[PDB]
């Protein structure tokens, strides 16, 4: 999905293995905040949110808590106390088109900043001046969305990148999303300290 229309997937009751993703060189960016990226499989939270979108390379640095810019202010804002991970990878071979791609958009103007995890897809004409726009674009009246125009020949800073932000939400409810929790071999007839199911 476009960055301004970021898609959200809800994850309840499913084991996941963040070790095969952390060990993958395919992902150009793997940065976690509030939780160590190494120690990830042990953690347990009741729900998981997966926000997904596409940006350009120069904006990948903007997907982090406490950041500012077009994307952070007008497209996708992360809270300061965000507890989760941000993963990004170069999608030039998929989301770039010769002549420029028109499918991925981003909000260019907005009168106020987005709240954390807010989703704004309004196409109201931005009034930059004192004269009120009446639905028609013009001087000081611009369309809020702009196309990235992703091309395969673009610079890697302007090439398309697919970004997925995983957040782990714990509420006043049982924790239903759990890690792999691998096991080991068992030995008999020897004094052992054991850890069975619970």
């Amino acid at each position, epitope marked *: 999905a476009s960055v301004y229309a970021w898609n959200r997937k809800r994850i309840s009751n499913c084991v996941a293995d963040y070790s095969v993703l952390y060990n993958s060189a395919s992902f150009s960016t793997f940065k976690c905040y509030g939780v160590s990226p190494t120690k990830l499989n042990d953690l347990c939270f009741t729900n998981v949110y997966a926000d997904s979108f596409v940006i350009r390379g120069d904006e990948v640095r903007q997907i982090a808590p406490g950041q500012t810019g077009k994307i952070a202010d007008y497209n996708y804002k992360l809270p300061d106390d965000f507890t989760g991970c941000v993963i990004a990878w170069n999608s030039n071979n998929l989301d770039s088109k010769v002549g420029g791609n028109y499918n991925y958009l981003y909000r*260019l*103007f907005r*009168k106020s900043n987005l709240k954390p995890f807010e989703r704004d897809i309004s196409t109201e004409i931005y009034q*930059a*001046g*004192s*004269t009120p726009c009446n639905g028609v674009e*013009g*001087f*000081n009246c*611009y*369309f809020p969305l*702009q196309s990235y125009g992703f091309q395969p020949t673009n610079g890697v800073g302007y090439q398309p990148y697919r970004v997925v932000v995983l957040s782990f939400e714990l509420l006043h409810a049982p924790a239903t999303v759990c890690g792999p929790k691998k096991s080991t071999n068992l030995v008999k007839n020897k004094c052992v300290n054991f850890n069975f199911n619970g």
Partner: antibody
Amino acid sequence: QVQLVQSGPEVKKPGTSVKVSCKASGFTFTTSAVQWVRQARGQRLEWIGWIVVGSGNTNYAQKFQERVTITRDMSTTTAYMELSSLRSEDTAVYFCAAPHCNSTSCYDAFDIWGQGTMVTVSS
Amino acid sequence: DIVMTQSPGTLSLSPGERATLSCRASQSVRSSYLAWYQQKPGQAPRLLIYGASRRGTGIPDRFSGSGSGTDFTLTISRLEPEDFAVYYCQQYGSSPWTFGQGTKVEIKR
């Protein structure tokens, strides 16, 4: 120092191209617009065209739709005007104009103007 | 296209008199998208009036503006020696943003 500085004088042969620069200062370039206007020696002002800096959208006059292309580069806060297939009729002084703007709003007219760039085209 | 016509061609006036310039559009234009500029020989244009009736920054208060639709007026209450130059009116609402042909204000003698 809300400034708008243009290129120096240009002297080109007929059939060539000239690219006039126009650099902004003082205001936030990213949210403004830049127009280009020409004036022949002792003549009136002839509007060439304008560009929105944030989007890059351009509108040209009928008489310059064919040989003028207005561009911009927000990194170097500079806008350019490329004029292809020069001829003696193009010998004039060229101005760039822009409203000064802060991070969110703009002025309601073209109050910042460049010093002018004289382009002479002959053999 | 919107055609901008200015008058008079040459305004021969004495320093201290009241100057009055006219600007006519071939079709009705927005008052909030018309400007008046001053240009001296060998100099760049200087913004005088915008929004038909909004004085610009640094422009003396003797410059005024009025009009609506197709007819607009630039009024100089008391003409100063530093005011003798060329004056243009431009509409910037409907593209192309055409200019006028200019008005030369000379010192009468």
